[PDB]
A paper describes a structure:
In the present work, our attention was focused on a thermostable ADH from the hyperthermophilic archaeon Pyrobaculum aerophilum (PyAeADHII). This ADH is characterized as belonging to the medium-chain dehydrogenase/reductase (MDR) superfamily, with a size of 330 residues and a structural Zn2+ binding site made up of four closely spaced cysteine residues localized in a lobe at the periphery of the catalytic domain. However, previous studies have revealed that PyAeADHII has peculiar characteristics because the enzyme lacked activity on most standard compounds used to test the activity of ADHs, and was active only when α-tetralone was used as a substrate. PyAeADHII, possessing only the structural Zn2+ site, may be a hybrid between Zn2+-dependent medium-chain ADHs and non- Zn2+ dependent SDRs.
For these studies, we substituted the PyAeADHII enzyme-bound Zn2+ with cobalt and measured the spectral properties of the enzyme in solution, we obtained the crystal structure of both wild-type (PyAeADHII-WT) and cobalt-bound (PyAeADHII-Co) at 1.75 Å and 2.2 Å resolution, respectively, and determined the co-crystal structure of the NADPH-bound form (PyAeADHII-NADPH) of the enzyme at 2.35Å resolution. Examination of the NADPH-bound structures points to the catalytic region in PyAeADHII and an arginine as a possible residue involved with catalysis. To possibly identify residues in the active site of PyAeADHII we modeled the substrate α-tetralone into the NADPH-bound structure.
Author numbering:
A (entry chain A), B (entry chain F), C (entry chain K), D (entry chain E): -1 to 331
The structure:
């Protein structure tokens, strides 16, 4: 049997093509998913662009997705055909020091390898993943597909920031896929949350309904300093502001380098202020369960921008640069 | 009454001269100390050289000292005449947010101010300090005089590194005033400790006497990676090595910038490895008590190099640079 | 001046008499407050009844009050005449192990001595408290006066329960002075909050306005088990229920012994479930500032029942046992 | 193929017989182990006696053992024939909240089921265990065989006591299988360790070689209060001592109910002192790896007492009560 898929044999958004692919088949411990929705993320854009190398080639991208189990492989229990699932996107062995402490995204054995990057992903009608990565959910699958990358990454960032109730928390890029959940989880944890945006005027009512106590331009951020925590995955163009608005014991937490990876760090201010500069990536397997349950209970919300058919995958990827996008862009195969 | 003291009316090492000075008198809340031993540290050299503004001017430096109480001031209790004491050198208000959570070195009211920098210090026969800053001790005052700067700062770096039993801990600059205690505290917390030094041949048996499991040159440290924790206050010249040997979840802890303050921090590696880059300064007032108790009970050892009389203070501060020094330079007024 | 005051020269509520007393005067480090509101709590009742020895005799009770500074003592700066304040009620030295690590209610030197118990309290027009115990606030002093005992004790219980977002939290005695804030703080930390009441039908709409996700009868609590955290200051009559509904790694936190002090603890279920049974009392000096600012911000809400004048003080204390009460009972001198 | 085995078809020491039994064969995910040494614990005693129910019946006991992989079932990687292994004794699914957060001994799926209790155990020439439970080690298997019950359980008690360097930690029953390692771990975390024994004269030197700073009689212990931590798996006969010697913020941690499960708990002292009473059982799978490495590194030591052959399994079990015993009793099949 065969399937529709978006694939590229050489990198470049222009080489991403609708094709007819061989439908994959789950082996032991694997399930085959009929994909209902896949998110559109910087990660996916960058796999397509070649900035992140992929296997196998030619490659089907798509690391954030949800759908219905079509077939359980040999020996799979716990998930069965017809189950609506959402996929944890990190391959983990379950037996290394990192997996056994809960840090399955840091797996020493798989190298943190990511579904849709070191496997064929979900911009496709079907995808195979390990059964243990498929989390059964009763949530609307559009909303679920915003969880594996956006919500979970934001969760892990907020968890590693050690937010105490009443602490002031700035979220940089609060309008983005990660940010908009970063606002929510910082509020969940008791923070007073200041959402930072270069388009405050358009976005203020949205970010407040995400739970922001205040929306600030970058300039307003400077005056409102100091903050106890800055959650900022946007990279080096934000560094002078985000590093400079921290107070004593302030924690800068990043999981991305959107505008560049290299920053000039003043160790004298790092130690003079007792600041912590903290890396976060992906999220823990147990935390992904929590984030799913919280969506299902309505304690967090999914902000959707637009759903594209699989054939418009290119237009969908471009919509990531749209100055009007607030919310998640989805592909529906 | 007059006393001998090393003072400088204008910054610079050649401008540090022995003089006859007005003997200070303790106000309410203060104690007058007959200084027995003062430590010689980079902080003291930088005060005398002018990299740190000091007051009053002319200025008696000396931020790390121990001695005997000569007189208690109005309303002081708990500290009678002749009590041997060692002096916690941060001025703190005891009422601000930071003081009230225990981060007394971060006090918002005193500007973190340091005895012997914003007050006249211990390179003199007598000095005055707040009574709350004077810790009674039964320890040999030569050894007590290594605790306010070297031991306490190393204590506070180790504490903020979250050392678990069995984690691999590298100490860069391990031969120095801070590193020699950092080796000890890392072992005390149950780490497996790798002291790093450019003088391995000369210093190996001393760093083992301090509790190091292994003693490595910089190159050898690259081969022993990964490390869970790198205690390293040496600044930018060690950054590539120190940051490059960290494993997943690794903590870099710095309290200094000896060789340079600016480093190029790569956010991609920080988030991809979930590393934390952590600043540490001084130590908490309660932890200084603990450090003093640990010396009195023999759980940590002072490593001494030379004692100089107060007349030789120029020679004492130049010994900081000597490639034969391993251990603490003391001044005895 | 003379002032009015409730007072008892010998224990017993009938022997509590409105009198005219020597208006007290503030020494160094003290302030004299003009009490506007004072809360009524089991602690005030039990002090009046002789259960808790009081000093000095005859004694003015009243351990939770807010008002306006009448007169700064000598050397007191950082507060003015006419500044509205609310009183942190534990006396603390600021120099012991406990004070320096932030646990000022555990002070080794005052023994945790309480204002209105070891000093003349705020069931009176004026009272003298240490200046450092007096917190400036811009909130309604009626609501402020619910914080020194009710909110702060609840905060410290929730803080010591280690609530993660999504954990299930039961609050026994949610209708009371402590419970009504424990519901709120548990929600602030991201818990799913189940308030348990013996009078669900009457109080349910109130406890939901305090933030409870559900209100439960004791039988319904049994059916909703397991719970991650149980905040329960009610003592032994609630023990079998609260301890029995805990799940794996569950935490029982109490600050009270309302219905009895002794419980039969099954060590085999404690270890087999890895449960923690945790004590909590009072609150930290720094957290009191956080509770004040959270009231000022609107993030917590005070629930008031009735305000009595100093004349009807015995009726106000008798209102504690009133089975219709939900909220705080204030005395207004 | 047949093997030798100690087995009982009805509970009671007298019913434990040496038998010839069918040699077990490993299925998928399992390894067969030629047992070289197995520990003798109260747990194995109570299984043979009937206080702990077991399956299957008739039953081979033995929950703490090490040996050599003889065969691997289908699809087993990471463990091979010839590997010298020590067996983590909790069965764990690896997919539930407890497992994915690292608390494998609390698995919701297996109930925390223990090898040799719900499976055939190690009092035999061969046993089958899950491959993921077999930890290859370079230690002497005689010493490894003291880790699965004695060492790991102590580790997990110490872990859950949150021992700060310098804190006073009491170990009740320090002479026992668990206590002899608890002493060690408390010292490695930086505690000042007071070992408690009813036979101090007889055992003082041994406990001091395990790392105890002082050895105390029960009466000496009351006089040496307060302690910050009491590690005590001995149950109710020690409760008044252990609970009563705690200071402010003290932690009582238990993993056992040796002398009785029921204790009368004064909630009012619990909260007035902010004590935590903490259950601990087994240990985490990740910590078990940490414990084996510490043994391989000499940072902890095995205190052996006697090694019996399989046929003497009765006298080895009876050897648990020998008032001379200090050390592990072992069986060697
Ligand atoms: N480690 C991991 O597992 C993951 C890493 N990431 C990384 O995190 C980063 C963000 O991802 P995501 O939230 O989806 O990104 P989005 O593009 O959805 O959001 C980024 C937001 O940042 C702001 N922004 C964009 N450009 C700039 C700029 N030049 N200067 C200042 N602000 C800017 C915009 O907000 P506005 O216009 O309102 O100001 C924008 O909405 C990326 O680098 C991504 O690779 C993401 C997911 C997971
Ligand atoms: N924040 C605070 O409260 C405090 C901060 N500090 C700061 O910490 C830093 C260290 O102080 P201290 O321990 O007294 O310093 P020391 O000079 O006593 O020790 C520093 C050690 O670093 C090593 N070192 C020197 N230069 C280099 C280099 N180019 N590359 C690699 N290693 C080098 C040397 O070890 P070797 O030759 O064996 O390799 C030396 O022994 C200073 O910057 C000081 O200002 C110090 C005390 C308190
Ligand atoms: N350590 C400290 O600093 C402090 C300690 N405390 C202590 O905490 C405890 C509670 O204080 P507070 O909130 O002021 O008390 P309240 O009486 O105001 O509230 C107690 C609540 O518990 C429930 N309850 C009352 N009696 C019983 C009973 N007989 N059996 C079962 N449930 C009952 C009731 O709720 P419902 O009827 O709806 O079920 C009642 O509203 C007291 O023991 C007090 O002494 C209080 C403040 C500070
Ligand atoms: N939860 C879990 O995963 C585990 C739980 N356990 C439980 O922990 C408990 C202790 O185990 P273990 O160390 O093997 O036991 P041991 O008998 O080996 O040691 C107990 C020690 O306590 C002291 N003691 C013994 N009896 C009494 C008594 N009658 N009164 C006062 N002190 C006494 C003795 O020390 P001395 O004579 O020197 O005073 C003795 O050496 C047991 O109940 C066991 O079942 C054990 C392992 C794992
Ligand atoms: Zn792994
Ligand atoms: Zn301060
Ligand atoms: Zn105190
Ligand atoms: Zn499990």
């Amino acid at each position: 049997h065969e399937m529709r898929a978006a694939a590229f044999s050489t990198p470049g958004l222009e080489n991403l093509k609708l094709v007819e692919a061989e439908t994959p088949r789950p082996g032991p411990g694997e399930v085959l998913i009929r994909v209902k929705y896949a998110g559109v993320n910087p990660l996916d854009y960058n796999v397509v662009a070649g900035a992140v190398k992929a296997s196998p080639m030619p490659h089907i991208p798509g690391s954030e997705f949800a759908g219905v189990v079509e077939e359980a492989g040999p020996g799979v229990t716990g998930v069965s055909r017809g189950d609506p699932v959402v996929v944890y996107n990190r391959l983990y062995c379950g037996h290394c020091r990192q997996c056994l402490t809960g840090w399955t995204q840091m797996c020493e054995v798989t190298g943190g390898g990511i579904i849709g990057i070191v496997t064929q992903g979900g911009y496709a009608e079907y995808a195979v993943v390990p059964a243990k990565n498929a989390v059964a959910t009763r949530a609307d699958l559009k909303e679920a597909a915003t969880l594996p990358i956006g919500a979970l990454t934001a969760w892990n960032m907020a968890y590693r920031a050690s937010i105490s109730p009443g602490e002031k928390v700035a979220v940089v890029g609060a309008t983005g896929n990660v940010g908009i959940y970063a606002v929510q989880f910082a509020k969940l944890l008791g923070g007073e949350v200041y959402a930072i945006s270069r388009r405050k005027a358009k976005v203020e009512s949205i970010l407040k309904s995400a739970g922001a106590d205040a929306v600030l331009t970058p300039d307003e951020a400077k005056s409102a300093a100091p903050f106890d925590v800055v959650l900022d995955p946007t990279g080096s163009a934000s560094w002078d502001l985000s590093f400079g608005v921290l107070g004593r014991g302030g924690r800068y937490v990043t999981a991305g380098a959107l505008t560049g990876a290299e920053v000039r760090l003043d160790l004298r201010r790092l130690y003079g202020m007792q600041i912590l500069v903290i890396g976060a990536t992906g999220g823990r397997r147990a935390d992904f369960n929590t984030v799913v349950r919280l969506l299902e209970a309505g304690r967090i919300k999914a902000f959707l921008h637009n759903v594209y058919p699989l054939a418009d995958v290119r237009k969908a990827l471009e919509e990531l640069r749209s100055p009007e996008r607030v919310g998640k862009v989805l592909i529906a195969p």
